């Protein structure tokens, strides 16, 4: 009929170049070629069919839409429905084989995409059609959904041999209980995870060898049975420099984190652990840095530490520089306030306002400053140079007062190895001043051998004469000192009672060397009786400044 | 016919299958049926619109163009001009409202796009077309721009229910100054906001209920009226776990950021207030992270905190630890050398080129480590262990000099309660030594009660003998101690200036204990005038030490 | 002609409205009017192209195709290949200077594409397809791929005028060694780069004027013949508040970082240099935070510093406080166990597990806590108020003993102008107690000057009696002392060895200070022989305290 347009192939008939007609089912097809006798149902050569986008064209760009669909390709092209139900692997798959695609693969706009197979990415990263909340809202509008219940998956990870991208993705494994399904497997070398929100399965994400270069940051991590996130490292490779920043782990059965092994250079900061029975557990954690965590509530355990390390002492270096807020049942070993062990102390520096802290992980010695002063682990507590090789004494300056002029007046010490002192100064006359601790030393005759203090000794010269001495390599000398001779206990040890004078002579190093320069190897102390006898005590005490 | 291709609907025509005719309005259409007698253009079951997208297919796929749709959609879909002039917010809200779009609102390539009302999100989170600089060339390329004159929009937020994304977005309020229009209303629980450009609005961000689990990044926050971003919390919720991160703030009326109640555990770093009126206000602030604040200029402020704490002792707990920039009227109650105030302190640990400080909010306490060393705030340092079950002494050590072999020699001190030592060493003779600072004890007949130095005290036993004595519960004992008696004021408390010889006796713990093992009790000591009279000073002082 | 569609315009006909027809070369068009005589081959007045997207609709939304087009525009719109051979450089300026384009310029989702001619972006940000590994499997899939051999790019860099983003991209230079091909230039002033991977090139990122407000995050940058990051800052406005974080520089011939000038309050943090020949120089850093660095080997250098700051003391105010990892070759100006210098010291706070420690760029003052104790660079430490105008003493209590409850008892000491004590306690019998360190003062007949301590010297009176007293401006007192007077050396400074015997009386300040208030001036010392005549020794010592 002449009322419609309809024409199907004829073998009789040549068609001219742009010649329109029918396939036999309805399309239609455009000759590119003049005298064209083939049936386009059977062979296309010559001809075109009018309803590819090949065929259409922007006029805007002078290009063809066929061009234009090549600006952004999904799932949605290779078959996938993302309709809650249908099974959408296969699309996946076809993605990650095809020629067509680029480094990473992409969600459509709106969808529910079902997973009941494992996806093999072939390289690619992952790219999603959202971050969402954990709740259905946002699952039906944009998520992949992997069937835990499928037999294909059990023990599995759903998508194996991703690429360095996992990004603006929520994913949740739908009843997976029991089933052991794992979400991703990533390569720690070279890696960005950002903005991703996930929920249930085994290992949410499963890190292959080790960290280098691995970045992860803004995280929804919800409801996993076994971990966050998992690196076995079964080569024992050493993971390093990874980064986890702004990560929520809730409600899971296990650890945020777990390394079978070792890592090293790793920073942690704004991490959630809520309702979790494990924070982070690894072998070895040695020059990592921790900032900020919040840790509140056990989902079924009673008391679980935020930071696990299970090698003897192989926490250490670390750095512990934020708050971590501990709430219902948490406990942390890196508390600058906590007592040191003599071994297996996570070791490192602790800043927060609890304290600022630092200890080392073999060994007892820890210091804490707080508001009121200082506090240490081992009893004890040096004052040195930084310097290793410099061996002058230290001085230690302390404010006593005030100058005439009303500002702050710092008064210096002395500890060198023949003088202790403590400075002062009287601003009313301009006149420094000395607090001392003078060396002391006794005689006895009942001792089996002679005090020494700092290489002096008394020994008796003879009757009632006694040397205030050097020993054989002493070489120092006193130099204009002060001295006071103490009490004599006369007779026997317990004493008499019986008192005696006494008097002093200087012992010169050099003919001269008192009389002229106040320089003395020692002195002499003479004892007498009333009568003016000499006289021996039984014991006396001498005490002695090497200096003025 | 004959000569140009139209047909029109004919009812007595019967179209076979695969015949096209036009429709009234001349689009083309296609029977999918045989024997079709329907009218299309009141009836199109039977036929399909041949230039519809579902009947144009891309052949490297084999879908069609409307699965291909599907990838990305915009509000441009729902006819969104973004022409700098036309009202879209009805297209806006048709995108919310759409069964066919995903998690987040997303714009076209290029446009301006105008509003004149509130949009819905109705969950939906907000995808942008760039975030760019504060200039109309970028505003023309891509933005949203609020009209705050609208009447509609008068004290009212342009966006609200918003979804937990915002990013990669610029947008401005056109002619609202006075308006009180603000930008978008977000729920505080799960978000994440990055890479935005926010300019004027009267607060830019509006958290609705309180953070956790909020995650703020690289924003361009440009004039805003009240804040940049404002939290209420009017439940008093308490927010939590909040993270502001690259966040420049210039040229307010306002603050950067108001909450109205409580911060606890939040995270603020790299933060810039330029020309802004205010910084941070909260109520409280506990155990919250501040990194990096570069703070430059007032708007028309003469002086403002960086940190503004309203609440009294509610500054609490919180890490400064980075360096805080002041220029041009900017102060601070957060440097690590403020003075200690005894209540109100902004409660914290302090760390940066300043000093390293440590102080708590209801207390004088506060120590400051510098260069110099170190500076207190309530005119005390303590020393002492970490353990608070510990009571043993300490043992200070500290470099002297240097030993035989050239290396450090850290002498060791001693403070007891019954010893005050300071150790040395001679390494010419290699003998230990010590410096001393006894108990001195003074007798004086004139005193209302005796001196009493750590349990000991001086009592007359008879004319000449005095015994320096223990009082009852002192058990303390002296081992092979040092003695020294002091000068004797005669006759009188002022002294004749007579004198007067003395002897001691010591005074046992048990028969034979200073004999045999140099352990006394005390001792006793007997003055005798020239005659060698026992006699009785009026005044005299003892020094004495319990250990050699 | 009978069985097939094919007319062309007949200037004899009159085309209806809906008529359609086909040009010269084969496209259908149909007339949009009544009457229609126009040839549409010379004059498209009045007829439309239906293989038009303007023609096609999606009746889902009831828009065209057109529309949906401008939801995504890449280069691939201006016909750019991405096929790894040909040049596109003329496609990405036809985008960059379109009037249908947003704020940013973005690639296809598949393409390796060539530039061999400069591309001046106008002001537009760079999008890529993808942050891929460094490997052609993923510069295959999406990367910018600039021709270095090109000699229209020798000495130039190969996109100018970037806007304010730079995302998600992979960008390398092929076959440019030694042709000094830059990548790209962008203005420091409000910048987000992240996710991006950059390979080989001489200057990666070149930025224009001076930081501020700059953010860099999460970048591998590869191979760079000169620098990472270079930044000249020409007119030295001085660069500020900069952030650079996540960024992995390796196997670059040059530094990672170059700045020519200066550079404030820019914060550095999780950087990585592998095999470098130097990391971040720059004339000038001030006030800048720094993290964690791993710096592991060097590419043909032997030694070089992390950080490196030309300029004399130009290095100041910093924030060393994270760990930085030193591997073969790799040195540090920074370590808090490092000795200061007394000028060019890098002048910050430094706090990792090796030390916490403090010091100033011009100084040789610096502070180092370890788990030991302190460390001090200048053989000093202070100990004073952090106001600098409190001036009374301080107080220092440490551990020495239990109290009666078994509680740790902290003792006091006493450090004042007049009194050096330290306090103890015998809880056996409830009393306190004192360590004294006394005044010491020697008179000798053979010092051309009397020996002062404090305010009080030694003065002959009469024979055989001293006066210890104060000299003019002296108007601090004596309460309650302990006075004990020394060993005399008569008949000269050497001494005879003769003794004799003193006695003591005090010095009121006014009529009964003594007597009443135990408030003494000094006092007066009286020597005398055997027969009791007053004698003069030539030297003696006296200790006293000038409190109880």
Same mark, same amino acid.
């Given at each position: 009929?002449?009322?419609?347009?309809?024409?199907?192939?004829?073998?009789?008939?040549?068609?001219?170049?742009?010649?329109?007609?029918?396939?036999?089912? +309805?399309?239609?097809?455009?000759?590119?070629?003049?005298?064209?006798?083939?049936?386009?149902?059977?062979?296309?050569?010559?001809?075109?069919?009018?309803?590819?986008?090949?065929?259409?064209?922007?006029?805007?760009?002078?290009?063809?839409?066929?061009?234009?669909?090549?600006?952004?390709?999904?799932?949605?092209?290779?078959?996938?429905?993302?309709?809650?139900?249908?099974?959408?692997?296969?699309? @996946?798959?076809?993605?990650?084989?095809?020629?067509?695609?680029?480094?990473?693969?992409?969600?459509? /706009?709106?969808?529910?995409?079902? #997973?009941?197979?494992?996806?093999?990415?072939?390289?690619?990263?992952?790219?999603?059609?959202?971050?969402?909340?954990?709740?259905?809202?946002?699952?039906?509008?944009?998520?992949?959904?992997?069937?835990?219940?499928?037999?294909?998956?059990?023990?599995?990870? /759903?998508?194996?041999?991703?690429?360095?991208?996992?990004?603006?993705?929520?994913?949740?494994?739908?009843? +997976?209980?029991?089933?052991?399904?794992?979400?991703?497997?990533?390569?720690?070398?070279?890696?960005?995870?950002?903005?991703?929100?996930?929920?249930?399965?085994?290992?949410?994400?499963?890190?292959?060898?080790?960290?280098?270069?691995?970045? !992860?940051?803004?995280?929804?991590?919800?409801?996993?049975?076994? /971990?966050?996130?998992?690196?076995?490292?079964?080569?024992?490779?050493?993971?390093?420099?990874?980064? !986890?920043?702004?990560?929520?782990?809730?409600?899971?059965?296990?650890?945020?984190?777990? &390394?079978?092994?070792?890592?090293? +250079?790793?920073? &942690?900061?704004?991490?959630?652990?809520?309702?979790?029975?494990?924070?982070?557990?690894?072998?070895?954690? /040695?020059?990592?840095?921790?900032?900020?965590?919040?840790?509140?509530?056990?989902?079924?355990?009673?008391?679980?530490?935020?930071?696990?390390?299970?090698?003897?002492?192989?926490?250490?270096?670390?750095?512990?520089?934020?708050?971590?807020? #501990?709430?219902?049942?948490?406990?942390?070993?890196?508390?600058?306030?906590?007592?040191?062990?003599?071994?297996?102390?996570?070791?490192? =520096?602790?800043?927060?306002?609890? +304290?600022?802290?630092?200890?080392?992980?073999?060994?007892?010695?820890?210091?804490?400053?707080?508001?009121?002063?200082?506090?240490?682990?081992?009893?004890?507590?040096?004052?040195?140079?930084?310097?290793?090789?410099?061996?002058?004494?230290?001085?230690?300056?302390?404010?006593?007062?005030?100058?005439?002029?009303?500002?702050?007046?710092?008064?210096?010490?002395?500890?060198?190895?023949?003088?202790?002192?403590?400075?002062?100064?009287?601003?009313?006359?301009?006149?420094?001043?000395?607090?001392?601790?003078?060396?002391?030393?006794?005689?006895?005759?009942?001792?089996? %051998?002679?005090?020494?203090?700092?290489?002096?000794?008394?020994?008796?010269?003879?009757?009632? =004469?006694?040397?205030?001495?050097?020993?054989?390599?002493? %070489?120092?000398?006193?130099?204009?000192?002060?001295?006071?001779?103490?009490?004599?206990?006369?007779?026997?040890?317990?004493?008499?009672?019986?008192?005696?004078?006494?008097?002093?002579?200087?012992?010169?190093?050099?003919?001269?060397?008192?009389?002229?320069?106040?320089?003395?190897?020692?002195?002499?102390? @003479?004892?007498?009786?009333?009568?003016?006898? #000499?006289?021996?005590?039984?014991? !006396?005490?001498?005490? @002695?400044?090497?200096?003025?």
């Amino acid at each position: 009929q002449t009322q419609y347009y309809l024409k199907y192939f004829n073998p009789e008939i040549v068609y001219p170049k742009n010649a329109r007609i029918m396939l036999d089912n +309805g399309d239609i097809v455009r000759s590119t070629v003049v005298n064209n006798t083939s049936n386009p149902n059977v062979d296309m050569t010559g001809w075109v069919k009018v309803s590819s986008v090949s065929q259409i064209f922007d006029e805007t760009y002078n290009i063809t839409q066929s061009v234009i669909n090549g600006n952004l390709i999904t799932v949605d092209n290779f078959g996938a429905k993302g309709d809650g139900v249908t099974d959408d692997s296969a699309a @996946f798959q076809a993605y990650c084989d095809s020629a067509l695609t680029g480094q990473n693969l992409y969600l459509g /706009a709106k969808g529910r995409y079902i #997973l009941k197979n494992q996806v093999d990415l072939k390289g690619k990263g992952l790219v999603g059609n959202g971050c969402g909340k954990v709740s259905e809202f946002y699952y039906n509008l944009g998520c992949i959904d992997v069937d835990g219940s499928s037999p294909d998956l059990q023990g599995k990870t /759903a998508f194996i041999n991703c690429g360095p991208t996992i990004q603006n993705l929520t994913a949740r494994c739908s009843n +997976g209980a029991g089933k052991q399904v794992s979400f991703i497997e990533i390569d720690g070398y070279l890696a960005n995870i950002d903005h991703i929100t996930l929920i249930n399965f085994y290992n949410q994400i499963v890190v292959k060898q080790a960290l280098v270069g691995f970045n !992860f940051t803004n995280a929804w991590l919800y409801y996993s049975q076994n /971990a966050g996130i998992y690196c076995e490292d079964p080569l024992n490779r050493v993971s390093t420099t990874g980064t !986890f920043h702004n990560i929520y782990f809730q409600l899971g059965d296990g650890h945020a984190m777990i &390394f079978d092994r070792d890592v090293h +250079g790793c920073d &942690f900061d704004n991490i959630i652990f809520e309702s979790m029975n494990g924070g982070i557990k690894a072998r070895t954690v /040695a020059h990592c840095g921790f900032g900020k965590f919040w840790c509140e509530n056990l989902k079924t355990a009673t008391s679980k530490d935020w930071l696990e390390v299970t090698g003897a002492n192989s926490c250490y270096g670390n750095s512990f520089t934020g708050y971590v807020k #501990l709430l219902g049942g948490w406990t942390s070993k890196t508390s600058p306030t906590l007592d040191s062990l003599p071994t297996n102390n996570y070791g490192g =520096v602790s800043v927060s306002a609890e +304290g600022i802290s630092i200890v080392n992980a073999g060994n007892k010695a820890k210091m804490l400053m707080l508001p009121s002063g200082f506090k240490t682990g081992n009893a004890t507590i040096d004052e040195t140079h930084i310097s290793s090789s410099t061996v002058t004494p230290l001085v230690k300056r302390r404010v006593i007062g005030a100058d005439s002029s009303g500002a702050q007046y710092l008064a210096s010490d002395t500890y060198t190895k023949l003088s202790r002192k403590w400075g002062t100064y009287n601003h009313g006359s301009n006149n420094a001043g000395a607090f001392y601790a003078p060396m002391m030393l006794t005689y006895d005759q009942s001792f089996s %051998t002679p005090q020494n203090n700092n290489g002096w000794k008394i020994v008796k010269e003879s009757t009632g =004469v006694y040397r205030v001495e050097r020993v054989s390599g002493n %070489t120092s000398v006193i130099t204009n000192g002060h001295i006071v001779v103490g009490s004599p206990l006369m007779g026997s040890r317990l004493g008499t009672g019986t008192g005696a004078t006494h008097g002093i002579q200087m012992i010169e190093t050099y003919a001269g060397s008192w009389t002229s320069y106040t320089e003395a190897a020692g002195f002499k102390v @003479f004892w007498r009786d009333s009568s003016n006898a #000499l006289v021996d005590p039984h014991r !006396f005490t001498v005490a @002695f400044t090497a200096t003025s």
